[PDB]
Design a protein around this ligand. Structure first.
Ligand SMILES: CC(C)(COP(=O)(O)OP(=O)(O)OC[C@H]1O[C@@H](n2cnc3c(N)ncnc32)[C@H](O)[C@@H]1OP(=O)(O)O)[C@@H](O)C(=O)NCCC(=O)NCCS
Ligand SMILES: CC(C)(COP(=O)(O)OP(=O)(O)OC[C@H]1O[C@@H](n2cnc3c(N)ncnc32)[C@H](O)[C@@H]1OP(=O)(O)O)[C@@H](O)C(=O)NCCC(=O)NCCS
Ligand SMILES: NC[C@H]1O[C@H](O[C@H]2[C@H](O[C@@H]3O[C@H](CO)[C@@H](O)[C@H]3O)[C@@H](O)[C@H](N)C[C@@H]2N)[C@H](N)[C@@H](O)[C@@H]1O
Ligand SMILES: NC[C@H]1O[C@H](O[C@H]2[C@H](O[C@@H]3O[C@H](CO)[C@@H](O)[C@H]3O)[C@@H](O)[C@H](N)C[C@@H]2N)[C@H](N)[C@@H](O)[C@@H]1O
Ligand SMILES: Nc1ncnc2c1ncn2[C@@H]1O[C@H](COP(=O)(O)OP(=O)(O)O)[C@@H](OP(=O)(O)O)[C@H]1O
Lengths: 176, 181
C-alpha cells in the first residue's frame, strides 16, 4: 500500500471508469459530472487491491491569486477510500503521493475539504484559510462565502498570511 | 520493444531531477535565442514535459500545462503547450514532430483542447498537423476583469478534442504573470 501516480492521459477507458465509479460511491453519490471533470488533467494517486481501485486522490494544476500574485497551485480533488477499506490509513498513502507532487512542481497545494477530513489535513501540516475566499469569475472577482471555512493550503516555497484574501480561478460547478 | 530512440518521453515536472531541470532550462533558453524570461520558464512548470534524449542530453522539449480558456462563458479544460524547442544542432530532422506526437497524445487523453501561442516560424508546422488558427479576438481574464490582448491576436492555435469550437469567436485565457498567452 503505497500509491502509484498516473497522469490522466495515461489512464485507459476501463481504469478511468473504475476510478470515477469508486469515487462516486465513496462520496455516497454526492459527486457530480463537474466534480468528476475537476479531477481530470493532472496526476492521480491510486492504490489497487486485486485489480480493483481502492483509493484515489488527484492533484490538478490551477492558479490561486494571493496578494496580486497568481500562485502555481496543485489542487487536490476526489480524495476517496473505498468504504470497506476505511480506517486503515490508506488516505495517508494517497497524500504522501499528492504531497510529493506538490513539493516537486508547485508553490502551494490547496483543496476544499469535507468536514470529516479537516483533522487529517491539519495533522499533516495543511493550514485552514481564515481570510475571505473569492473566485475570479468572467465578470470579475466574486466572493465565495459558501466555501469559507473549507479551504486548506499547504505552502511549499512561500510563507503565507492565511487571513489575506485568496481568489481561485474560474471553472464550472464548485469553483473551490 | 525497440530502443525507443528519439521517441519523446513524458515526465511530470515533479519527477525531474535538478540536473535534467537545469538542462531543459538552458537548452530551451538557448533555443529561443535568449528571449525566454524567468516567467516564460515558470510557465513550463506543473504539467508533463515531453523530452527527447540523445547521449544523456535533452535535445528537444515541449511542456503541456493545464489551464482554463473561457469560450462563450464556458471554462474549457486546456492543455497549453509551452517551451517547444529542438536544440539547434538537431533542427531540420522533424524531431518537433516526435515532440508533438506526445503532446497531442496528452491532449486526447486528458483535455478538451490543446492550445498554444506560436512563434511565427512555427505557425505552419502546427497548421499542417491539424491545429486550427484562432481567428477571433483574444483576451485574458485579469484580476480587474476581461481585457483584450491584441498583441497576441493571430498567434494562437487550438486542437479541439471531440468539442466543436467557433474559432472566429472571442477566446479569453486565465491569468498569470508575464505573457498571458
Ligand atoms: C476521508 C477518507 C478519505 C479517509 O480515508 P481513510 O483511509 O479511511 O482514513 P483513516 O484511516 O485515517 O481514517 C479516518 C477516520 O475515519 C474513521 N473511520 C475508521 N474506520 C472507518 C470505517 N470503517 N468507515 C468509515 N469511517 C471510518 C475514523 O474517524 C478515522 O479517524 P482515526 O484515525 O482517529 O481512527 C474516507 O473516509 C472517505 O473516502 N470518505 C468519503 C469521501 C470524503 O469525504 N473524502 C474527502 C474529501 S476532502
Ligand atoms: C520550431 C522548431 C521547434 C522546429 O523543430 P524542428 O524539429 O527543427 O522542425 P522541422 O524539422 O520540421 O523543421 C522546421 C523548419 O525549420 C527550418 N530549418 C531546417 N533546418 C533548420 C536549422 N538547421 N536551423 C533552423 N531552422 C531550420 C525549415 O524551414 C523547416 O521546414 P521544412 O521541413 O518545411 O523544410 C525549432 O525550429 C526551434 O526550436 N525553434 C526555436 C524555438 C521556437 O520558435 N519554438 C516554437 C515555439 S511555439
Ligand atoms: N462532493 C464532492 C466534492 O467534495 C469535496 O469538495 C467540496 C466540499 O465537500 C463536499 O461537501 C460536503 C459537505 O461538506 C462533503 O461531504 C463533500 O461532499 C464542500 O464542503 C465545499 N463547499 C465544495 C468542495 N468542492 C472534495 N474535496 C471534492 O474534491 C469533491 O469533488
Ligand atoms: N519567448 C518565449 C516564448 O515564445 C513562444 O510564445 C510567445 C510567442 O513567441 C515568441 O515571440 C517571438 C516572436 O513571435 C517568438 O520568437 C517567440 O520568442 C509570441 O509571439 C506571443 N506574443 C506570446 C507567446 N508567449 C512560445 N510558444 C512560449 O512557450 C515561450 O515561452
Ligand atoms: N443537518 C445535518 N445532518 C447531518 N449531517 C450534517 C448536517 N448538516 C451538516 N452536516 C454535515 O456535518 C458537516 C458540517 O460541516 P461544517 O463545514 O459546518 O463543519 P463542522 O462539522 O466542523 O461544524 C459536514 O460533513 P462532511 O463535510 O464530512 O460531509 C456536513 O455534511
Amino acid at each position: 500500500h503505497t500509491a502509484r501516480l498516473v497522469h490522466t492521459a495515461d489512464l485507459d477507458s476501463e481504469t478511468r471508469q473504475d476510478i470515477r465509479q469508486m469515487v462516486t460511491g465513496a462520496f455516497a453519490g454526492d459527486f457530480t459530472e463537474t466534480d468528476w471533470e475537476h479531477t481530470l488533467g493532472g496526476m492521480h494517486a491510486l492504490i489497487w487491491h486485486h485489480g480493483a481501485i481502492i483509493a484515489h486522490a488527484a492533484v490538478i494544476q490551477r492558479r490561486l491569486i494571493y496578494r496580486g500574485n497568481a500562485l502555481r497551485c496543485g489542487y487536490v480533488e476526489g480524495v476517496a477510500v473505498r468504504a470497506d477499506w476505511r480506517g486503515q490509513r490508506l488516505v495517508s498513502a494517497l497524500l504522501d503521493a499528492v504531497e510529493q507532487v506538490m513539493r516537486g512542481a508547485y508553490q502551494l497545494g490547496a483543496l476544499s475539504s469535507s468536514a470529516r477530513a479537516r483533522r487529517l489535513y491539519a495533522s499533516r501540516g495543511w493550514l485552514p484559510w481564515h481570510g475571505p475566499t473569492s473566485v475570479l469569475a468572467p465578470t470579475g472577482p466574486v466572493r465565495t462565502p459558501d466555501d469559507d471555512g473549507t479551504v486548506f493550503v499547504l505552502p511549499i516555497d512561500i510563507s503565507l498570511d492565511t487571513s489575506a484574501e485568496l481568489m481561485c480561478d474560474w471553472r464550472a460547478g464548485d469553483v473551490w
